[PDB]
Amino acid sequence: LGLHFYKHGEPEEDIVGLQAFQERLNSYKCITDTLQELVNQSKAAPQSPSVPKKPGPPVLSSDPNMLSNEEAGHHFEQMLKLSQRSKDELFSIALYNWLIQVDLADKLLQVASPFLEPHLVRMAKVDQNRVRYMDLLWRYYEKNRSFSNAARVLSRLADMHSTEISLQQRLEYIARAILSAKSSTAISSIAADGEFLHELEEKMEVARIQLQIQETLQRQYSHHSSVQDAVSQLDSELMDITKLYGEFADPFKLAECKLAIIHCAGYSDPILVQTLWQDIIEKELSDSVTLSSSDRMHALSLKIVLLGKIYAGTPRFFPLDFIVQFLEQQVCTLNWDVGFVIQTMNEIGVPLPRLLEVYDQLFKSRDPFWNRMKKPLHLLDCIHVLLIRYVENPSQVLNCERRRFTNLCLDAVCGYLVELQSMSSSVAVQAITGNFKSLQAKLERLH
């Protein structure tokens, strides 16, 4: 009757099923409170020996009936591994509730019992702490390898309720939903678990922008009152980009966040996108001024390699040709390595033939900048490093395209050697004419 009562609904009319449910629980209590005694004994701090208030041998000032932390832990594990032999489903439910109430969560996730999934699938509709049971349920589905169900419960911590310990927990749930959906689609290529996967990876960057705001209120404004209001609002949901701009990043004037917010949400492309990539480059150039050129190269590489691995999939948001010209105009100004912009674009994963089409057209522009900066050869040194990097790792071009590309590289190297041999024959023009003929004399073997 106490298990019938539970299975139909715990209803207020069934006073007899309620009494049977209570008298089963009263009987189970001698198990729970003995497991509580052994867990309180094994969780206890070991007593620092009180300085003997008379000289002598050490007195063992403990009752010989007492257990140590190791005995209390052994007898707890042995009594738990007696309780785990029961048939009783309502006792299993009482033991599940007790394992949650003592924070023994991975030991709940050690009970291979068919009653555990139905129990979490009750509690995640009925307890006000609904969140903790969806958490235990996705952890249960992952540990039992039902990754498609785990993903569809981690959704139901973004899309349906949470409470958590900070916004950084939402970023575990989203990253682990992404891991569960990538595990699902690698197991069975159902479009919906790969369609929801883009929605999760968009939610991930909005949640990163939400965290960049939330921590920046803590890092800049934390002596004002309504930072507590705003940080706890930024903790309690996953916000859209309208809130994150209009309610948070504009009133706190966070230009650093305004910039990141408008880097994504459906906006007008070339002119505005190009400004945001200048602002992102010139901020990470500004705020790195305390470091050496090697460290500032590495910091700007990490920025543009991170953001490029998002937006290079969507070339409205990644204006490659402008980003290459601006980074090379900065390298040309700052006196950084000629390999730098070539490394950054290779480590994004930009297709090396399309990367050559950019430096090729930037050279053919004959831009007055390289002349103004007294480096009128610079883009030929870039093209040399790019083409030597291709020649001594030919895997950077696809095994069908490579024979189209070794023509285009010889055709272009012949063009640059006609250009160079029209220039005034300085030691740099002589050396680069040598470098391009050394490159030719390798490309002539790559075909």
């Binding site: 004002h224 309504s226 859209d240 980009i241 309208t242 209009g246 009133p251 917010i261 994504c264 949400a265």
Partner: peptide, 19 residues
Amino acid sequence: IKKLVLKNLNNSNLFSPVN
């Protein structure tokens, strides 16, 4: 949501206590 809307015409002041 991944669509931005500017609306400077009505904001809460985030350099004030609440009323």
